[PDB]
């Protein structure tokens, strides 16, 4: 098993330290179930983000092997380009020998300047990996570095230390009751069929089944702008001058749970999960966004669902298991 602890930063990002090379150079990265590529800032990046973050130096760690394969990758927050390479990556206790990863060359857009992490570690299927680069987990299994072809995620609420990604094992005590093994839909993202979304006695959003991705690399619960406008006035949100989706925190004291039924089992999301009380006010945790070019209208069950549910992503059995935490 590998134990990779994660820093919870303002309940909006969750990242961990991995070390690349021998001797280990040190990097912060998100562990993202919505991408499959690992990259680095390298020393050949002159972008603003790159003056701001730890940069890998190929020259100084003795096990790297260079490649002439390039890596361009577009995401929702912006884009980056780099070159691939092989080095040992120390992750959660395991020395993943000869892992291919990206050394970035450019990283535009100020998102990545302000972002507290250096790079990205993707945990979804190799299908979505640009350049066909072998994703970390896949490379741990191909080497037998793990006993079980599954990894489990724990994500803390309230800014407490303790979120972890158990590489190759499940920690039974992190959840109450039993796991419920839901099947995947398309093998690329951790995509599953959502049967409905109900407020109180009546369905408000998936009246015919919707498709959802289970995604640690996003803070909010997102669905399409249509269904979402519909949830926003239901919970009582309004537009603020700035653009914020404002709600009164009193609503936590008076609003009922929303229920997402995934493959038979009803999973509730309480108001203290989907309405955030921040240093500013209370805003909704539902965000409008429309799905990217190569896929059909995705719902993203982000950090606001994961925090409340122990999730296991079983590669061996192509299933996701879910259980109420604690």
Q: Considering the candidates 11, 195, 215, 303, report the single residue annotated as catalytic.
A: 215
Burial of residue 263 (number of CB atoms within 10 Å: 0-12, 13-18, 19+): middle
Domain with CATH 2.40.70.10 in the chain: 1-170, 171-326
Candidates 2.60.120.10, 2.60.40.3470, 3.30.365.10, 2.40.70.10; CATH matching 1-170: 2.40.70.10
Radius of gyration of the chain from Cα atoms? Answer: 20
Residue 137 and residue 142: Cα distance in Å, rounded?
Answer: 9
Q: Is 317 helix (H, G, I), strand (E, B) or coil?
A: coil
Q: What is the DSSP string of 66-77?
A: EEEEEEEEE-SS
- Deposited experimental method: X-ray
Report the side by side order of strands in the sheet with 164-167.
2-5, 164-167, 150-154, 309-314, 319-324, 180-183
Q: What is the DSSP string of 95-127?
A: EEEEEEEEEEEE--STHHHH-S-SEEEE-S-GG
Contacts of 208 (CB under 8 A, 6+ apart): none
Number of H helices, E strands in the chain: 6, 25
- Per-residue burial over 5-23, b if 16 or more Cβ lie within 10 Å, else e, is ebebeebebbbbbbbbbee
Burial of residue 180 (number of CB atoms within 10 Å: 0-12, 13-18, 19+): middle
**Tokens (6 digits) for 48:** 């603003």
- 234 flagged as catalytic: no
- Per-residue burial over 114-143, b if 16 or more Cβ lie within 10 Å, else e, is ebebbbbbbbbbbebbbbebbbbbbbbbee
- 215 flagged as catalytic: yes
Contacts of 296 (CB under 8 A, 6+ apart): 211
Candidates 3.10.450.50, 3.40.50.2300, 2.40.70.10, 2.40.50.180; CATH matching 171-326: 2.40.70.10
Q: Does residue 65 come out as left (phi exceeding 0), alpha (psi in the -120 to 50 range) or beta? A: beta
Residue 221 and residue 224: Cα distance in Å, rounded?
Answer: 10
Contacts of 43 (CB under 8 A, 6+ apart): 55, 56, 57, 58, 59, 103
In three-state form (DSSP H/G/I as H, E/B as E, the rest C), the secondary structure along 268-288 is EECHHHHEEECCCCEEECEEE
- Per-residue burial over 61-71, b if 16 or more Cβ lie within 10 Å, else e, is beebeeeeeeb
The single residue listed with the structure tokens 């535009």 is 108
171: DSSP letter: -
Q: What is the DSSP string of 209-230?
A: -EEEEE-TT-SSEEE-HHHHHH
35: DSSP letter: -
Q: Considering the candidates 32, 96, 195, 314, report the single residue annotated as catalytic.
A: 32
Burial of residue 146 (number of CB atoms within 10 Å: 0-12, 13-18, 19+): buried
């Amino acid at each position: 098993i590998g134990d990779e602890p994660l820093e919870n930063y303002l309940d909006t990002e969750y990242f961990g330290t991995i070390g690349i090379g021998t001797p280990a150079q040190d990097f912060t990265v998100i562990f993202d179930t919505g991408s499959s590529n690992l990259w680095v800032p390298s020393v050949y990046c002159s972008s603003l983000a790159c003056s701001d973050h730890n940069q890998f130096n190929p020259d100084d760690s003795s096990t790297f092997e260079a490649t002439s394969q390039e890596l361009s990758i577009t995401y929702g927050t912006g884009s980056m380009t780099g070159i691939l390479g092989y080095d040992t990556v120390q992750v959660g206790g395991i020395s993943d020998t000869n892992q291919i990863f990206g050394l970035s060359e450019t990283e535009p857009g100020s998102f990545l300047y302000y972002a507290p992490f250096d790079g990205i570690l993707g945990l979804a299927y190799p299908s979505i990996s640009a350049s066909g680069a072998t994703p970390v987990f896949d490379n741990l299994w191909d080497q037998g570095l793990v006993s079980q072809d599954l990894f489990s995620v724990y994500l803390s609420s309230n800014d407490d230390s303790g979120s972890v990604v158990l590489l190759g094992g499940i920690d039974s005590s992190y959840y109450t009751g039993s796991l419920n093994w839901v099947p995947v839909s398309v093998e690329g993202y951790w995509q599953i069929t959502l049967d409905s979304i109900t407020m109180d006695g009546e369905t408000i959003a998936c009246s015919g089944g919707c498709q959802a991705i289970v995604d640690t690399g996003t803070s909010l619960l997102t669905g399409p702008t249509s269904a979402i406008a519909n949830i926003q006035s239901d919970i009582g949100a309004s537009e603020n001058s700035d653009g914020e989706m404002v709600i009164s925190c009193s609503s936590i004291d008076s609003l009922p749970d929303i229920v997402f039924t995934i493959d038979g089992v009803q999973y509730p999301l309480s108001p203290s999960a989907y309405i955030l009380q921040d240093d500013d006010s209370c805003t909704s945790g539902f965000e409008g966004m429309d799905v990217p070019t190569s896929s059909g209208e995705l719902w993203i069950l982000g950090d606001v669902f994961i925090r409340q549910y122990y999730t296991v992503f079983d590669r061996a059995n192509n299933k996701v298991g879910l259980a109420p935490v604690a």
